[PDB]
Amino acid sequence: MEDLNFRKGDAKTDVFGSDRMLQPSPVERIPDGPTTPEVAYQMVKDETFAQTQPRLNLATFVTTYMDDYATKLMNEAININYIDETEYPRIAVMNGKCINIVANLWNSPEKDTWKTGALAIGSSEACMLGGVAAWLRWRKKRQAQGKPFDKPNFVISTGFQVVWEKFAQLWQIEMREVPLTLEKTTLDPEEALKMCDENTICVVPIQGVTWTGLNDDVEALDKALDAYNAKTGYDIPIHVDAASGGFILPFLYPDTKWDFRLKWVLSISVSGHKFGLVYPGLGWVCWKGKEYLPEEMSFSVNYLGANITQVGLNFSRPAAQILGQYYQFIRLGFQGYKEVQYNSLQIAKYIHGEIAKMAPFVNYSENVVNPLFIWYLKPEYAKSAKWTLYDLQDKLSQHGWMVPAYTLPSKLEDYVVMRVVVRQGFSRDMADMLLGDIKNAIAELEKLDFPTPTRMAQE
């Protein structure tokens, strides 16, 4: 009854009684030959155990939970390539309907039924498309004026997210950075104007600054730019990087005027996979009207009577995230989105208030307007403490959390902060678990008799 080939991968092989599971996974070259599907499944899957669990990843802004029905719907669409719009025209129209809904969430004045916007893989592509459109609009203007157009720049807070550095590098466009101070913890419009000139293609205020959790004041920026543009004729626009805030502000702060209600906001981008409540792979960019999307970048095709704009950096891509976005819009509606974001914001405020009660800590802001916030060590506490927030990050990782510590951008670079992001699926109960682990970690770190490596590096 001996099975000659049991260790070699036949129908009787046990995965963990096989020769293949005594061998390392391939690092440099494809294996010469195959294995059983069960063996290969375990070899790939087992490597993903030893890292952060997504629901305990508190560094990320990107969705780690959807309900079972959205998840089934997206799984069922795993083999649907969005870009095959002639073959899958219902998904092309569904994409156009999502774009319409987003543009109207942002109060677009565009009268066309099919709003001018584009699907993206995240805010990276959406921001780049907005920035490229702004660059081409500026080039066209300056050429018509007989002015040089070879030295473009854009203006942004030092609180920028790295995709704006990617944009600057990949297109060779100069990024001008407005520093953060304790007195100006968000983009100050007067400071932004100091960096504007005839070569500025746009200013980029951020709704949901990743470093701080705050919102740049888009209305204040719009007012300053209106006076500046009237005086110079430079006609510098705004592109709003609303990666998180674009799905927070419409529901919880409808009266905050930050979007297409503003004269100079010509385009807005968002991460559908952050607070749009869809699994990874979704962003959106909208323009205020077709006249702000250059023809040099774009065309539109009619699918089943819908006019669908064709602009993007990617081509073939999963369609699942479109179904997921449209499901969330129908399943939740405005009320449902409001209640989910309310929960996330209330839990963030709850953690913020509990952090403030702890002896080592002080919050950077009293104002929690997105479901995330940052804190640092009280300066008097930090001076005689043996530990830093990097040490607290390490302690929390021992229980499976990722809670990141980092230094703030320019002029606040002496501030080591820690950030918590509250996403859908992070509950009050999970917040209580986190806070209990933070209190326990503090108590252990306060037993140290000698300074840690990062504490010594701060001297």
Ligand X SMILES: *Cc1c(COP(=O)(O)O)cnc(C)c1O
For position 410 contacting its own copies by CB under 8 A, the verdict is no
For position 122 contacting ligand X by CB under 6 A, the verdict is yes
For position 457 contacting its own copies by CB under 8 A, the verdict is no
How many whole angstroms separate alpha carbon 63 and alpha carbon 274? 5
| Nearest position to ligand X, beta carbon | 122
Query: Long-range contacts made by residues 95-102, C-beta under 8 angstroms, separation at least 24?
Result: 95/119, 95/308, 95/322, 96/303, 96/306, 96/307, 96/308, 97/306, 97/326, 98/284, 98/322, 98/325, 98/326, 98/329, 99/284, 99/286, 99/309, 101/329, 102/246, 102/270, 102/284, 102/286
Which amino acid would we find at residue 300?
S
For position 328 contacting ligand X by CB under 6 A, the verdict is no
For position 413 contacting its own copies by CB under 8 A, the verdict is no
Nearest distance in Å: CB 8, its own copies: 8
Q: Given the complex with ligand X, which of 168 and 385 has the nearer CB atom?
A: 168
For position 161 contacting ligand X by CB under 6 A, the verdict is yes
For position 299 contacting ligand X by CB under 6 A, the verdict is no
Which residue in 106, 138, 275, 303 binds its own copies (CB under 8 A)?
Answer: 303
Annotated binding site: 123-124, 271, 273, 316
Contact 371, 248 (CB under 8 A): yes
The b/e string for 317-336 (b: 16+ C-beta within 10 A; e otherwise) is bbbbbbbbbbbbbeebeeee
Nearest distance in Å: CB 264, ligand X: 19
Contact 221, 187 (CB under 8 A): yes
Q: Given the complex with ligand X, which of 103 and 163 has the nearer CB atom?
A: 163
**Which helix (H) or strand (E) covers residue 378, if one does?**
none
Q: Residue 117 carries which DSSP code?
A: E
| From its own copies, ligand X, none, interface partner of 244 (C-beta below 5 to 8 A by class) | ligand X
For position 132 contacting ligand X by CB under 6 A, the verdict is no
Nearest distance in Å: CB 305, ligand X: 15
For position 325 contacting ligand X by CB under 6 A, the verdict is no
For position 215 contacting ligand X by CB under 6 A, the verdict is no
The binding site for ligand X (CB under 6 A) comprises 61, 122-124, 127, 161, 163, 206, 208, 210, 241, 243-244, 271, 274, 283, 315-316
